[PDB]
Amino acid sequence: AVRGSIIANMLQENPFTLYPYDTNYLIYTNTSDLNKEAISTYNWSENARKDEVKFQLSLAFPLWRGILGPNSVLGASYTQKSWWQLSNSKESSPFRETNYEPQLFLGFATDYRFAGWTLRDVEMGYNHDSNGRSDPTSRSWNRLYTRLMAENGNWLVEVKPWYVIGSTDDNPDITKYMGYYQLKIGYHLGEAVLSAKGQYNWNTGYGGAEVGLSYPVTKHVRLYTQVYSGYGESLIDYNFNQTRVGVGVMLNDIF
Amino acid sequence: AVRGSIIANMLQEHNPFTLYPYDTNYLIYTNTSDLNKEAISTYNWSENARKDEVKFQLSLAFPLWRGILGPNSVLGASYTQKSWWQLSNSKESSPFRETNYEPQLFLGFATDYRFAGWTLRDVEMGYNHDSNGRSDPTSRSWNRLYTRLMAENGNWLVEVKPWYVIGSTDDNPDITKYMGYYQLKIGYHLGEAVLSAKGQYNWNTGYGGAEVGLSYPVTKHVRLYTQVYSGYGESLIDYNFNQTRVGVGVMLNDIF
Ligand SMILES: CCCCCCCCO[C@@H]1O[C@H](CO)[C@@H](O)[C@H](O)[C@H]1O
Ligand SMILES: CCCCCCCCO[C@@H]1O[C@H](CO)[C@@H](O)[C@H](O)[C@H]1O
Numbered sequence: 001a002v003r004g005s006i007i008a009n010m011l012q013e014n015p016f017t018l019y020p021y022d023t024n025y026l027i028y029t030n031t032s033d034l035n036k037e038a039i040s041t042y043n044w045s046e047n048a049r050k051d052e053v054k055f056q057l058s059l060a061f062p063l064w065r066g067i068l069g070p071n072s073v074l075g076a077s078y079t080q081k082s083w084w085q086l087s088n089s090k091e092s093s094p095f096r097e098t099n100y101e102p103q104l105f106l107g108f109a110t111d112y113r114f115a116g117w118t119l120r121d122v123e124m125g126y127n128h129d130s131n132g133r134s135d136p137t138s139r140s141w142n143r144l145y146t147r148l149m150a151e152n153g154n155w156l157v158e159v160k161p162w163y164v165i166g167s168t169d170d171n172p173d174i175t176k177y178m179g180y181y182q183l184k185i186g187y188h189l190g191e192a193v194l195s196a197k198g199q200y201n202w203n204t205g206y207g208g209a210e211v212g213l214s215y216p217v218t219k220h221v222r223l224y225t226q227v228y229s230g231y232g233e234s235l236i237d238y239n240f241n242q243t244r245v246g247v248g249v250m251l252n253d254i255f
Numbered sequence: 256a257v258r259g260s261i262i263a264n265m266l267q268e269h270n271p272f273t274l275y276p277y278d279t280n281y282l283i284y285t286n287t288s289d290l291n292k293e294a295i296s297t298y299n300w301s302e303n304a305r306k307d308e309v310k311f312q313l314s315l316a317f318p319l320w321r322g323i324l325g326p327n328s329v330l331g332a333s334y335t336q337k338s339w340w341q342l343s344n345s346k347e348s349s350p351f352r353e354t355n356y357e358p359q360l361f362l363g364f365a366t367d368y369r370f371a372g373w374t375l376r377d378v379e380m381g382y383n384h385d386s387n388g389r390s391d392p393t394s395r396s397w398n399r400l401y402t403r404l405m406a407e408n409g410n411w412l413v414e415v416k417p418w419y420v421i422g423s424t425d426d427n428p429d430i431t432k433y434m435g436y437y438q439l440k441i442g443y444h445l446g447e448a449v450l451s452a453k454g455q456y457n458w459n460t461g462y463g464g465a466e467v468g469l470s471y472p473v474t475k476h477v478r479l480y481t482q483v484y485s486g487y488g489e490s491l492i493d494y495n496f497n498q499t500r501v502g503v504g505v506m507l508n509d510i511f
C-alpha cells in the first residue's frame with residue numbers, strides 16, 4: 001500500500017476498477033523540429049505542423065495473483081502514446097504516430113531496505129514496442145527487461161535495464177539511440193510531483209530526457225507540464241533529435 | 256453499488272491509482288468474412304490485407320466533478336478506442352488497418368425511477384466525437400449530441416442511446432443511412448456468465464448491424480470472451496460495408 005508501487009497496487013483487492021501502470025495524460029505540445037523525411041510516404045507529410053496533441057494511456061492487468069507466493073503476480077500492461085495533428089484541418093487532422101507497448105511480466109512487491117531506500121518493485125518480463133505501420137514507416141523492437149523501483153522519503157527511483165531480442169530490421173541501430181536501460185526519478189514536493197525519465201548511451205553519446213511537473217488542481221485532474229529533449233521521443237523519431245514542450249491534464253503521476 | 260451503472264461507479268470515491276471503466280475492455284483474435292480493401296486502396300498494403308485481425312477496445316470514464324447538479328450527479332468524460340490490427344500480416348509489417356477514437360463529455364445522474372418492473376438507473380446527456388485519425392481519402396468522422404438511458408430488471412440490463420448528428424459529416428455524408436439515430440444494448444446475467452447484444456438499425460433504409468457476445472470469469476479481473484459482429488458500421492472505414500466477424504479472447508469488464 002505504497003505511493004508509486006505498480007505491483008503493490010495490482011495486488012490490492014469493485015470489478016469495474018482498472019489499474020494504471022504508467023502515467024495517463026493528455027497535453028497540447030509544440031516541437032522544435034518535425035521529422036518530415038521519415039513520414040515522406042504519407043500524402044499529408046509536406047504540410048505537417050509542429051503543434052500536436054500528445055496523450056498516453058497506460059493500464060496494468062493482474063492475471064494471476066500469488067503465482068509465486070503471496071507477494072507476487074503474473075501480470076500484463078499496455079501503454080499507448082499518440083501524436084495527433086489536431087490543428088491541421090487542411091490535411092484532415094491525422095495522427096502522425098502512435099506507439100503501442102504491450103508487456104507480460106512476473107512482478108514482486110518487496111521491502112528490501114538499504115541506505116534509507118526501500119526496494120518496492122521487482123518486475124521481470126517481455127516488452128514489445130511498435131508503431132502499427134507498414135513499410136517504410138514501420139518501426140519495432142522487442143526486449144526482455146527488469147524493472148526495479150525503490151523509494152526514499154520524497155524520492156522515487158526506477159531503473160529498467162533490458163536485452164533486445166529478435167529482429168530489429170525496421171530500425172536496426174535503435175539501441176544506438178535508446179541504450180540498454182531507462183532511468184526514472186520522481187520527487188514529491190508537497191502534493192506536486194517533479195519527474196524525469198530518460199536514457200543515455202555512454203558509448204554513442206545519444207540519449208533523451210523527459211522532464212515533467214504536475215500538481216492536483218482537483219481530486220480528479222492534475223495539471224501537467226512536460227518537456228521532452230533529445231532522441232527517441234517516438235519510434236518514428238528514434239534517430240531524430242528535437243525539443244518538445246506541452247501543457248495539459250493528467251490522471252496519475254509516477255507517485 | 257449497482258452492477259452495470261457507469262454513473263453510480265463514477266460517484267464512488269476510492270487510493271488515487273484506480274481508473275473507472277466506461278464501456279467494455281477486451282482483446283480478441285478475429286476472422287472477418289470480408290476485408291474492405293476498396294475503402295483502404297490508398298494504403299500501399301491494401302491488396303495484401305488478410306481477413307484475420309486482432310481487435311481490441313479500451314474504454315475509460317473520468318469523473319471531473321461529482322455533485323455538480325446534486326448528490327447523485329456528475330460532470331464526466333469518457334474515452335473509447337477500438338483498433339483492428341493486421342497482426343499476422345508480417346508480409347506487410349503487420350500494420351493497423353483502422354482505429355476509432357471516441358471521446359465524450361457528459362452530465363450523468365444515478366437514478367431509482369421504477370416503472371413496470373424495470374428500474375431506470377442511469378440518465379446521461381453529452382457530446383460525442385468519433386474519428387478514425389486518418390487523412391483524405393480514408394478520413395471518417397461524425398459528431399453527436401446524445402442521451403444514454405440504462406434500466407435493469409432482475410437478470411436483465413437494457414441501454415438505449417439515441418442521438419442527433421451535429422455539424423459537417425463531409426468524410427461520410429450518408430453515415431446515418433447505415434447507423435441510424437440510436438443504439439440498443441441488452442445484457443443478460445446467466446449465473447456468472449454474461450450474454451450481451453449491441454446494435455443499431457435504420458428502419459427507413461433497412462441498414463444495421465449487431466454485436467453479440469458471451470463472457471465468463473476466469474479470475475476476479477479476467478474473463479474469457481467470444482464475440483460475433485454482423486452487419487454494417489463495425490468501424491468508421493466500414494460504415495457502408497457489410498461483414499460478419501467472429502472473435503475470441505479476453506475481457507476485463509463486461510457490461511455488468
Ligand atoms: C505550449 C504549447 C505550444 C503552443 C503553440 C501552438 C501554436 C503554434 O502553431 C504553429 O502554427 C504555424 C503556422 O500557423 C504552424 O505552421 C506551426 O507548425 C505550428 O506549430
Ligand atoms: C522507520 C525506519 C526506522 C529506522 C531503522 C531503519 C534502518 C535503516 O538504516 C538507516 O536508517 C536511517 C533512517 O533511520 C537512514 O537515513 C539511513 O541512511 C539508513 O541507512
Ligand SMILES: CCCCCCCCO[C@@H]1O[C@H](CO)[C@@H](O)[C@H](O)[C@H]1O
Nearest residue numbers: 113114115116117118151152153154
Ligand atoms: C522506530 C523509529 C520511528 C521513527 C522514524 C523516523 C526517522 C526518519 O528517518 C527516515 O527513515 C526512513 C526509514 O529508513 C528512511 O528511509 C528515510 O530516508 C529517513 O530519513
Ligand SMILES: CCCCCCCCO[C@@H]1O[C@H](CO)[C@@H](O)[C@H](O)[C@H]1O
Nearest residue numbers: 218219220221268318319320321322
Ligand atoms: C474539472 C472542472 C473544474 C471544476 C472543479 C471540480 C471540483 C471538484 O469536485 C468535488 O470536490 C469535492 C470537495 O473536495 C469532493 O467532495 C468531490 O468528490 C469532488 O468531485
Ligand SMILES: CCCCCCCCCCCC
Nearest residue numbers: 078100102130280281282311
Ligand atoms: C484487455 C485490455 C485491452 C488491452 C489492449 C492491448 C493490445 C496490445 C496492442 C498491440 C499493438 C501492436
Ligand SMILES: CCCCCCCCCCCC
Nearest residue numbers: 025026055334356358386388
Ligand atoms: C487521457 C487520454 C484521453 C485521450 C483523448 C484523445 C481524443 C482523440 C481524438 C482523435 C480523433 C480524430
Ligand SMILES: [Ca+2]
Nearest residue numbers: 133138139348
Ligand atoms: Ca510494423
Ligand SMILES: [Ca+2]
Nearest residue numbers: 092388389394
Ligand atoms: Ca481525420
